[PDB]
UniProtKB/Swiss-Prot annotation:
GO terms for cellular component: periplasmic space. It is found in: Periplasm. Cu cation binds at residues 53, 92, 95, 98. Residues 1-105 form the Plastocyanin-like domain. The chain holds residues 27 to 131 of 131 of the full protein. Binds 1 copper ion per subunit. This is Amicyanin. Primary acceptor of electrons from methylamine dehydrogenase. Passes those electrons on either a soluble cytochrome c or to pseudoazurin. It comes from Paracoccus denitrificans. Disulfide bonds: none annotated. It comes from the Bacteria. Its cofactor is Cu cation. Keywords: Copper, Electron transport, Metal-binding, Periplasm, Signal, Transport.
Length: 105
């Protein structure tokens, strides 16, 4: 796959790793809707608002299967470690008007 998943569970915002590239979620938006990272970087999404959100990549984007990330409650987080250059678009499953992308380069 073009990304690996360190934790299938969401985890606490305080548990975010040094060196992770953070995208905050608040006001029903991904706060960095276009993020540029390098191969091998870990991107960590952190939900900063009461409304639960996830990240969802359709099939073929990160690998053969869709990746429907777990729902993050407020102050929960979720990571992906990207292993291949490319453009990876995602959305929020319950809120598909929320869109972003990670460009790995
Ligand atoms: Cu959402
Ligand atoms: Na992004």
């Amino acid at each position: 796959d073009k990304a690996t998943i360190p934790s299938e569970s969401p985890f606490a915002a305080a548990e975010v790793a040094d060196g992770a590239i953070v995208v905050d979620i608040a006001k029903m938006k991904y706060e960095t809707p276009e993020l540029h990272v390098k191969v091998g970087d870990t991107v960590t999404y952190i939900n900063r608002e009461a409304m639960p959100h996830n990240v969802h990549f359709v099939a073929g984007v990160l690998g053969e299967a869709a990746l429907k990330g777990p729902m993050m409650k407020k102050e929960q987080a979720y990571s992906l470690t990207f292993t291949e250059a490319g453009t990876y678009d995602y959305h929020c499953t319950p809120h598909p008007f929320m869109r972003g992308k990670v460009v790995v380069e």
